[PDB]
């Protein structure tokens, strides 16, 4: 902990399906929301998850 913040510690907040036990994913890409093709833009409901 640090005053002003300590931001080393991220976490996935958005994914596709339910992850199975005891594997991981470091596939840092865009996130896609709906029926729009964003696929690596942002702003209009795209993300970094």
């Amino acid at each position: 902990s640090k005053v002003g913040g300590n931001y080393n510690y991220r976490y996935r907040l958005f994914r596709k399906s339910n992850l199975k036990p005891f594997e991981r994913d470091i596939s840092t890409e865009i996130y896609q929301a709906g029926s729009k093709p964003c696929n690596g833009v942002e702003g209009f409901n795209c993300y970094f998850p």
Epitope: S1, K2, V3, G4
Partner: antibody, heavy 120, light 105 residues
């Protein structure tokens, strides 16, 4: 555990004063310390905190900007460095221990015995 | 996150039992400590973390309570144990002490 504080007396409104807190017994590093004032005829209220090395110091109201707390475990003491004071924070001051940094740190708490500062 | 001690001064004789309540502005768990400050002394701590008192404090001092409401109980102290009492939290930064409750006769 033991705590001995020093740097009390009478000053003028607009001088400085070395507020020092010496610790022994328990290991002075791995441990979070802080200060607490009490104006005579009041309750209890805190001053400033330091986190086991100088990377993060939090402050209270109306003492931010006149108070620079620093610790140094290579000479195992604590400082407030009251600086350019007011004629209204005449009080008694105590250095106390918040406690704990790792999992094996066995949190115990202890207090000093007071340091009196007065103004003119 | 501000503490408060709502019972004011009391007039319990050397005997009987006393029960002192401390609240909190939000959820604090097993993080309180009690202090008993005489007229003009250092505030001596009483109770580690809501349940176990420290060394040199007898068994008639007991500390309990949970959630956001905490209680210190004197079973049958003695003919002196009249001072002011404080509840302090060590959840986060920094440790707020509250208001305080005296006792008289």
């Amino acid at each position: 555990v033991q705590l001995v504080e020093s740097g009390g007396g009478v000053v003028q409104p607009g001088t400085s004063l070395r507020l020092s807190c010496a610790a022994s017994g328990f290991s002075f590093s791995h441990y979070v310390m802080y200060w607490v004032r009490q104006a005579p005829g009041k309750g209890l209220d805190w001053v400033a905190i330091i986190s086991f090395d100088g990377s993060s110091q939090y402050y209270a109201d109306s003492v931010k900007g006149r108070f620079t707390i620093s610790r140094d475990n290579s000479k195992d003491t604590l400082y407030l460095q009251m600086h350019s004071l007011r004629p209204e924070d005449t009080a008694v001051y105590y250095c106390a221990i918040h406690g704990g940094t790792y999992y094996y740190d066995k949190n115990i708490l202890a207090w000093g015995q007071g340091t009196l500062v007065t103004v003119s | 996150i501000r503490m408060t001690q709502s019972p004011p001064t009391l007039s319990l004789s050397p005997g009987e039992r006393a029960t002192l309540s401390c609240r909190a502005s939000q959820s604090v768990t097993n993080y309180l400590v009690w202090y008993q400050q005489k007229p003009g002394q250092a505030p001596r701590l009483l109770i580690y973390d809501t349940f176990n008192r420290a060394t040199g404090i007898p068994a008639r001092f007991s500390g309990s309570g949970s959630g956001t409401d905490f209680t210190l109980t004197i079973s049958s102290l003695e003919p002196e144990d009249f001072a002011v009492y404080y509840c302090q939290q060590r959840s986060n930064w920094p440790p707020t002490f509250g208001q305080g409750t005296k006792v008289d006769i």
